[PDB]
Amino acid sequence: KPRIGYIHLSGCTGDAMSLTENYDILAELLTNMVDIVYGQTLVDLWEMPEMDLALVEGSVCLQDEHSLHELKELREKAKLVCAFGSCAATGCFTRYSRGGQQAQPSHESFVPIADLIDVDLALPGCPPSPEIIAKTVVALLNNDMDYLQPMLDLAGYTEACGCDLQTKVVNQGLCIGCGTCAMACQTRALDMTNGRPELNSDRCIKCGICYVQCPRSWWPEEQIKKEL
Amino acid sequence: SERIVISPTSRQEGHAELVMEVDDEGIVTKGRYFSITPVRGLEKMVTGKAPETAPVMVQRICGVCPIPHTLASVEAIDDSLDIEVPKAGRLLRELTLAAHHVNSHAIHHFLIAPDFVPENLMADAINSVSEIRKNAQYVVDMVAGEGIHPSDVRIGGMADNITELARKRLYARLKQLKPKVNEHVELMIGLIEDKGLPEGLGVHNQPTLASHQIYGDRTKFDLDRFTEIMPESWYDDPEIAKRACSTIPLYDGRNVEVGPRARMVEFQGFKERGVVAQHVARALEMKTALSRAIEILDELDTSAPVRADFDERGTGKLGIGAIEAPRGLDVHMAKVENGKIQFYSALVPTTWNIPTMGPATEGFHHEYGPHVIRAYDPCLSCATH
Amino acid sequence: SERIVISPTSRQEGHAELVMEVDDEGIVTKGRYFSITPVRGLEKMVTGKAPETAPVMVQRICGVCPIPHTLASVEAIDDSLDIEVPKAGRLLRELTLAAHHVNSHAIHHFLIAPDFVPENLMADAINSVSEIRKNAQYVVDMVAGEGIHPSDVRIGGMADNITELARKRLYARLKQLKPKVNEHVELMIGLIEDKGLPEGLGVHNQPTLASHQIYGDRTKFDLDRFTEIMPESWYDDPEIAKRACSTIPLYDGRNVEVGPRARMVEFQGFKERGVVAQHVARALEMKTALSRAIEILDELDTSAPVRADFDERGTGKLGIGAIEAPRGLDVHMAKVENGKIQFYSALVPTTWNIPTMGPATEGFHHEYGPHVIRAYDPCLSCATH
Amino acid sequence: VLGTYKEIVSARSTDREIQKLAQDGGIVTGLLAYALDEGIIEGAVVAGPGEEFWKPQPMVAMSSDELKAAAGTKYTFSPNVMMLKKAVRQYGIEKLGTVAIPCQTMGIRKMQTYPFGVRFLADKIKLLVGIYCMENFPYTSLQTFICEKLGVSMELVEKMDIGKGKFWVYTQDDVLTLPLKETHGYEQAGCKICKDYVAELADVSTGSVGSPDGWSTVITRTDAGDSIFKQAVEAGLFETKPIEEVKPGLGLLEKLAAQKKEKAEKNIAARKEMGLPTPF
């Protein structure tokens, strides 16, 4: 019954695919668990209804008149606006773009939606793992925010280098060389030279998963409840 | 007359706006399809950047047909570089592509299912696609690192090669999956006919293009034949030419529709043509893919190296890599000079299609007309990049 | 019954007499097409004469499709000799052939326009063809010396190579021409459907033949497949067998229709077949030609030599040159011994057709029947030589 | 309006070669080349000619013959200013003069004011020349115009200039023009906020606008530039006629400059109203 809305401004669309990944949940889930409205991909109504939460796949583009126009509309329409996938949350690979590729050589600038409009929560990943996306939906559906405390916090996150866990953590002297953050690389750009993480930029999309998954970056004592 | 604009057209990745000119009966006269998505500009962003990067940035062009994109990019780059994948390494790539075709097609069915399948069935229908979809992913991720967006495929090889324990674990899953996929297509094939869209729907005279049924052959391709021209020339309207975000790639100066329907006619022999035909073609096409999946899998070296070592600094010479994405033919050309790409061009299967799609939506009452477009199952993010 | 003889059939180069056997309704039963033109006898006249001559005498075989004939002859001779055109030299030949296809097709439209186009339009329609025709000639004459009957093409090369100033002057003309040609075909394509000749007109089961969309490949051809048999066997009537001036060339013992329609189905993928279809095919075919025109033109060396020096005295060995004339496939075989041709044979695109044309004009009321023949746009002078 | 200036003139360089290949006036090439004679500048960095066709890649030419090759107009980004560190450093140049778009020009002066990690470079530039730029476009943005709009290869255009109210491509045997309103989408997002039509910062500024075809109007912003110009006119390289006298009126140029400011100002309000950072 709760209405979930997902609008993909400019996204590889992996994020949507990840959503379909949680198969066991999925077949029932659209039907029973959640109501999906105003998804151009998943539905065909052109103008958005008020929606309990809005999921925005991709970083907005300043130049495109429509994307900007749509984003402004979205804030009123969605009681809660959540940006998911790095491309909405951090701007992701988009940042590397320098415009000037035809057609439309002009479109060169893309920014995380978050900068344009306050966003309640963004969960990043390229795409976000299907499970996290399912866990949030059940959480959002089941209305618990102890769980989503980390994400509400993550909405702020925006720019994120691979480079940054080095500035954000290893520099702080926080890093203990556990290796968790390298494992959380979709790109596989990060790897551990003894024993700290060393990453090679040629291959980093700035998704931000490594800053997020370091135990050091923020420790929830929420989980302890989950195991036991 | 009266022209009706559908924007964005529903149920397809990205956004395209279809513009229609209709007679009083509402039979369409000119159908224009263009992609209004903002260009993420990968082709440009890759340039002057290292070869090692190019596969990673490029695959993000499209998270549905990521594996074909990665494969094409690596092939284009390895070709410009001249690395030779060892046969196990080559086999792993083909095995991943096959799993991907199977998966990608299934995703398409989920999207178009609502028009095709009655609601009573549909929850069951959707579940099956997820079931077929879920197994196929196991192969794509397991061989190629996490997929979607697998990071494992790399210039001149595969990052690592599956253990026999992994290969065995995979096989049972693929072999066991074979009955469900066979049935799933029949139900899909059964459903599509029932709809009985008016016969003669979506018939175009445009030439089809195929290189290979699954893995694409660079050799069967003509730079000489190929050309790309900007929408500004192609489109009727200044407004529409300016609006469109996609270059039209012309084969022999002729707009070309490349598809599973096209891949079948060129290689399988698929005399029938229709929109219903494109749909039928998508089913049998995954049917064929999945086979190769298991075929390559049974005969896999499993200890033969995947990586071939190569020299990154490159001769100026450009190379083309063409592989068949679930939505139609794809090629990547790259020239590597000084170890950083100097020219990068990608033509994605949708790109070929978008010009042919507008002429296709002519004749039959326009309510039908989005049905034709949706049959092509275009993913814009691919078309525009 | 009653058999009606049309002689010579109007609007086609040369003279052919079509003989028809009709039921009371007038639906035809046997359609016989033969060429009654006197043989100018080029194939024989060339023999025992020098290689240098053979291209010049041969092209006079047909002043409409002179460039294809010259090209074929040179290719056949150079092949028997074994000269290798340098790439610029080779490119010039292809560039000329493309201009020629474009032109030749336009000439065909002028001829068949009266049946197709209303008189009010027609003066305008004719003017456009002249306009498209006039630009194309510039390329054919400029590259190849005066054309029609260009004297410039020569064994093992081109006589001379266009200056950059010339190449530039040409390009704007071709590139600028592209919009008109695109529109011109649509009007032609639009006109042809309106006529609405009964569907199922001119459908034959005969196999089509194509080597290449423009420039023809010798390699894709079988001497083993090919055979030629005199009308005396093929024709029903002693009178008609004696009257006919043309040998019938048989592919795999099967009468063969080779055309733009054929060239498209083999290479482009042109599922539709009809007489209307042949007409549609002629338009899109020039459309494709003209592209290559500009394509080859943009990338032209302009200083690379055209001539490759060669030894005229030849090994007995015969060589085949096949190139696609505007009216269908063409090949020239020559054997040069002692520097003078010993055996020369030419099969011209019409020659292949003439047997298939009679069966084609069966079924539909005969008033229609010349319409089928005229669709093939045969030029007899080519068929008989 | 114009930036404060010592004087306004419309002038042409005398030399046949400068008139032959110079876009307008041939003043930039003539002024730059003369300095070489006088030696005020050891070398200058002038955009072009790039690997692509009609693509400018910045090059520092000591040689006058080289400056002539550089002379022409290519409407694309050529980052002239990248060179300046390179030119001073290796082909060691005590004083170097460069031709800079107003845009680049904005970039240098602050740097001369605030070197912040440019060493010794700052003193070295002797004469900086500013060329009025309304807007300029990416090579691809440019490429579309020449082909979708004008149906010509990038090879064919011998020279391309934006005539008043039009875009002109000059190709052997033809001249082709399309309206600017046609041009409107393509120029870079950055220029949307470029305030200065004339080069206010530049020591001397040269533009086509406000002068008859083949005549270039050079406005001398600063005294050093003025001096170099006075010297050249004494040289007689340039034939100078006071601007006001010759139509079109420099008032028109002034109007064009004003229009640019109106365009910048609102864009900034829109950017300012919106979140995204703005300089200016």
Ligand SMILES: Cc1cc2nc3c(=O)[nH]c(=O)nc-3n(C[C@H](O)[C@H](O)[C@H](O)COP(=O)(O)OP(=O)(O)OC[C@H]3O[C@@H](n4cnc5c(N)ncnc54)[C@H](O)[C@@H]3O)c2cc1C
């Ligand atoms: C992008 C651009 C836009 C312009 N717009 C206008 C305009 O709207 N109105 C107008 O009157 N004039 C404009 N100009 C300048 C004008 O067109 C003439 O080029 C010049 O002002 C007259 O100098 P000249 O006659 O001596 O020509 P030249 O002697 O040919 O001088 C041209 C010089 O410009 C330099 N140059 C060329 N391209 C670039 C580039 N991309 N960046 C930096 N420098 C370059 C070259 O080094 C060359 O030395 C523009 C110039 C540029 C580069």
Ligand code: SF4
């Ligand atoms: S977050 Fe990742 S998967 Fe999602 S649209 Fe952006 S790049 Fe694609």
Ligand code: SF4
């Ligand atoms: S998770 Fe953090 S501390 Fe642990 S290895 Fe990675 S960067 Fe170092």
Ligand code: SF4
């Ligand atoms: S290093 Fe890997 S996880 Fe971290 S931001 Fe780069 S791509 Fe993402």
Ligand code: SF4
């Ligand atoms: S319009 Fe402004 S920003 Fe653009 S090139 Fe000219 S000076 Fe630079």
Ligand SMILES: [Fe+2]
């Ligand atoms: Fe592309």
Ligand SMILES: [Fe+2]
């Ligand atoms: Fe013959």
Ligand SMILES: [Fe+3]
């Ligand atoms: Fe794709």
Ligand SMILES: [Fe+3]
């Ligand atoms: Fe002929």
Ligand code: NI
């Ligand atoms: Ni895709």
Ligand code: NI
């Ligand atoms: Ni002929």
